[PDB]
Amino acid sequence: PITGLVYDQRMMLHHNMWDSHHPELPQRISRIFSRHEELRLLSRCHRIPARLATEEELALCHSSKHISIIKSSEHMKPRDLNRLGDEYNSIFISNESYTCALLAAGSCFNSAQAILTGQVRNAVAIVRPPGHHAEKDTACGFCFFNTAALTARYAQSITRESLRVLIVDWDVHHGNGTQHIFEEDDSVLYISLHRYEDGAFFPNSEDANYDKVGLGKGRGYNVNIPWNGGKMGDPEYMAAFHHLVMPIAREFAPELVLVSAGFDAARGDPLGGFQVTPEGYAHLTHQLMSLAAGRVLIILEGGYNLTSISESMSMCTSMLLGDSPPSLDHLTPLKTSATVSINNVLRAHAPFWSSLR
């Protein structure tokens, strides 16, 4: 098989003991995996085994203090789990959360290894809890360790320190943790599309705005594409890819592409409120496959409509397997505010990318 797939039902054991209906559900990953079986995608893929991340691998991006505190939760009494989660913005913790965060990260390291050793061309990782809100020193927004950031540092640790890694973050939320981890880094190009609403959308920081371009040698290697005032869908995401993501990505010439693949911008997602279709995600996937000689690892982030995330991620795997990509309407006019967002990002990044000049 050209396409790898990682999935381990052990990542279901992370659970919310005070709200069993919290939308970051165990069954997010089992529903996506079941859909792969139903569509006969699983048997077309090379199965890659999950493993635990080591504490040494977590230290690629996270402080010893942060690793120690989350690790300390694995044997905590429920009262202590509840108090610990309450130290963070939007975290719940069970005795299994630490192990599950380790399995998500190690599953993606096994997937990046399979790509870079040439065992597979591309790969999908059906993992939880998600990662992109996780900072060097703290948990945030259902995320303990930053799986995608760790995977980029893991890839560099088995090739070269300056291996060009593109991270495309199409989850409807800003990956604040990913941006912060790589803010001063020109080896990892971070591109995020996210609902912003002038800071009313989680995680509610001006850090997500189009003028955050990177710091020092990192100037130009942080691309925020913020959506305001507007139910955004395939036309706006396609336009963002045409005008910003693909020109910048081709100029950067990545050696590995990681997708922070939240499916919470999907039609029917109750937290994202957007209308990206399964064919939209297939189109974005096929665009990214034109990069890095096709070396693309798709990492699950958010996505809360169980049916929508199952169908949407299955259509990404379908594209990685070389199935015929969709032909979508590039002439549909955009929401007026999306044109404004794209022009704001172009203005901010034209100093850094000759492809935008």
117 binds Cl ion (CB under 5 A): no
264 binds ligand N28 (CB under 6 A): yes
- Choosing among ligand N28, Zn ion, Cl ion, none, which partner's interface includes residue 22 (Cβ < 5 to 8 Å by kind)? ligand N28
Q: Segment near K ion (CB under 5 A), from 14-22, 212-220, 230-238, 324-332?
A: 212-220
- In angstroms, the CA 299 to CA 89 distance is 22
User: Whose Cβ is closer to ligand N28: residue 121's or residue 133's?
Assistant: 133
Q: 283 near 326, Cβ under 8 Å? A: yes
Helix residue ranges per DSSP H, the chain:
27-38, 55-58, 64-72, 78-85, 97-116, 147-157, 176-181, 234-240, 246-252, 278-288, 306-320, 336-349
Residue that has been written with the tokens 């991620």 in this structure: 313
- CA-based radius of gyration for the chain: 19
- In angstroms, the CA 67 to CA 69 distance is 6
Q: 174 near 196, Cβ under 8 Å? A: yes
**Burial category of 247 from C-beta neighbours within 10 Å (exposed 0-12, middle 13-18, buried 19 and up):** middle
Q: What are 103's two structure tokens?
A: 């399995």
133 is catalytic: yes
Query: From residue 156 to residue 195, what is the string marking binding to ligand N28 with x (rule CB under 6 A)?
Result: ---------------x-x----------------------
- Choosing among ligand N28, Cl ion, Zn ion, none, which partner's interface includes residue 43 (Cβ < 5 to 8 Å by kind)? Cl ion
173 carries a ligand binding annotation: yes
User: Whose Cβ is closer to K ion: residue 135's or residue 171's?
Assistant: 171
The helix (run of H) or strand (run of E) holding residue 47 is strand 46-47
302 binds Zn ion (CB under 5 A): yes
349 carries a ligand binding annotation: yes
Q: Segment near ligand N28 (CB under 6 A), from 19-27, 70-78, 206-214, 320-328?
A: 19-27
The helix (run of H) or strand (run of E) holding residue 7 is strand 3-7
188 carries a ligand binding annotation: yes
236 binds K ion (CB under 5 A): no
Other CB atoms within 10 Å distance of the CB of residue 323: 14
264 carries a ligand binding annotation: yes
151 binds K ion (CB under 5 A): no
* Active-site pick, 36, 133, 180, 194: 133
Q: Which of 182, 196, 237, 274 binds K ion (CB under 5 A)?
A: 182
86 carries a ligand binding annotation: no
Residue that has been written with the tokens 């540092």 in this structure: 153
Which positions lie near Cl ion, rule CB under 5 A? 40, 42-43
Residue numbering of the annotated binding site: 169, 171, 173, 178, 182, 188, 193, 212, 260, 264, 349
Residue numbering of the annotated binding site for Zn(2+): 169, 171, 173, 178, 182, 188, 193, 212, 260, 264, 349
Report, as residue numbers or ranges, the catalytic residues. Answer: 133
